[PDB]
């Protein structure tokens, strides 16, 4: 037999029972990626958080010319270290400003656009698509308001988005053509007086302003398409999951329309119980660390899986089962950990929140169209998804 295989499945609908195994037998062991290297899996809470809380496994350090890769780049390698530059140009205060919430106004514009995409699904007629039609453009329209940029232009930004987002074995060459058109589309934002709120604003400012007349222009402009892109394809990846896992729960989605206060604790546990990361998160080690049985080597890579962490029933007792009223909700490992842990936690969130709020006052009825094994999960890809969610209600 050859050596164990990573990813393990493409559906984001259940855990295979192969991660429990791992778990409790090896919760850290060797795979093979898809590029043919070696990495160590890490499956258990505990050896999860340690790798992400120590910083010599490193992020920026996986673009290394010749390390053992998980995947192909889809961007420029000095892109892997985004939120590294973005702090040592000064812009992490302003660019963490910039994404929260709580800007006047953008929840009452999530709620505006989310009851308008499902105006138009109920005008249609069943069945409707609740990625393609709901999920997407909701996340997309959250991110154009954010940036400040025209709601017109999130569509061909979205487009990028199915290959910018592959998990492949080798380059793409359409990769690099969509970021070479997107970084000039947002370098012309930069130089566009009708854009002046919103991220892609402040950074059209902090560029004319002394303290950061060195930034390069290549950064400000690489802040847009990268927030732009983690934001849309996380967010209504997660979405979109989530909806699933509702669907599936109709005692809970019974609870949640009853009782709309709850919603943030379920969607804390819909988050935890989310399979949308498709691989485990990469890191190489830049030290000889111990973790758990295994003498990690410097130079190796480790791939932290999320959901061994959040179905770990030493941290979250009957992992499986969404419990509004667990003690650590929070402690999940969705968002991530340590020094990269998720600028845009508190924002995705929100939008989970006031799409399923929406959802569920506009289709209270809302079941799958098809049965569950009929959804086709997206391979090669950075998240799983179906690429149709066909409802009725
Ligand atoms: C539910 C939605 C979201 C989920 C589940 C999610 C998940 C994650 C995870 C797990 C990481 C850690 C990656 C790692 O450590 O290797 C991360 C990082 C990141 N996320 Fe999110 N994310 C979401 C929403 C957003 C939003 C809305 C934005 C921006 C608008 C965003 C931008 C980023 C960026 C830029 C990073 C990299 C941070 C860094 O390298 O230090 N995410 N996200
Ligand atoms: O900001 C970053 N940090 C790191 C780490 C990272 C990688 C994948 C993710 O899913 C997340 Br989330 C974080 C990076 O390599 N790239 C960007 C995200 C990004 C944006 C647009 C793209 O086309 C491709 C990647």
């Not at 929840?107 to 698509?129: M, V």
């Not at 380059?171 to 690099?176: H, M, R």
């Not at 999951?241 to 599936?248: D, F, N």
């Not at 402690?331 to 950990?337: D, E, N, Y």
């Amino acid at each position: 037999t050859v050596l164990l295989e990573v990813p393990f499945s493409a559906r984001g609908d259940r855990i295979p029972d192969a991660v429990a195994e791992l778990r409790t037998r090896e919760p850290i062991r060797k795979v093979r990626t898809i590029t043919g290297a070696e990495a160590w899996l890490v499956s258990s809470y505990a050896l999860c958080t340690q790798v992400l809380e120590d910083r010599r496994f490193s992020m920026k350090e996986t673009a290394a010319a010749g390390a053992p890769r998980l995947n192909a780049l889809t961007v420029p390698p000095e892109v892997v270290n985004n939120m590294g530059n973005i702090a040592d140009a000064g812009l992490r205060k302003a660019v963490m400003k910039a994404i929260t919430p709580k800007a006047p106004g953008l929840e009452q514009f999530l709620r505006d656009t989310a009851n308008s995409l499902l105006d138009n699904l109920i005008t249609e007629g069943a069945p409707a698509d609740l990625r393609n039609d709901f999920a997407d453009p909701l996340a997309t329209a959250l991110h154009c308001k954010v940036l400040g940029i025209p709601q017109e232009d999130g569509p061909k930004l979205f487009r990028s988005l199915s290959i910018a987002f592959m998990s492949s074995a080798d380059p793409i060459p359409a990769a690099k053509i969509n970021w070479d058109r997107d970084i000039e589309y947002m370098a012309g934002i930069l130089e566009n007086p009708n854009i002046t709120t919103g991220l892609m604003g402040e950074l059209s400012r902090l560029r004319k302003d002394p303290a950061y007349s060195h930034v390069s222009d290549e950064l400000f402009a690489t802040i847009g398409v990268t927030f732009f892109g983690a934001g849309v394809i996380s967010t209504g990846s997660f979405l979109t999951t989530a909806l699933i896992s509702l669907i599936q729960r109709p005692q809970l989605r019974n609870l949640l329309h009853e009782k709309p206060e709850l919603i943030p604790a379920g969607v804390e546990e819909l988050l935890r119980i989310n399979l949308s990361f498709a691989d485990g998160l990469p890191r190489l080690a830049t030290a000889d660390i111990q973790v758990g049985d295994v003498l990690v080597r410097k130079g190796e890579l480790v791939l932290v899986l999320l959901e061994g962490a959040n179905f770990d029933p030493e941290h979250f007792p009957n992992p499986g089962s969404i419990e509004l009223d667990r003690p650590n909700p929070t402690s999940h490992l969705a968002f991530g950990r340590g020094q990269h842990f998720c600028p845009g936690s508190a924002l995705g969130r929100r939008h989970a929140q006031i799409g399923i709020e929406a959802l569920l006052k506009k289709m209270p009825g809302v079941d799958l169209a098809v049965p569950i094994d009929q959804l086709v999960w997206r391979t090669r890809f950075q998240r799983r998804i179906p690429e149709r969610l066909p409802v009725l209600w």
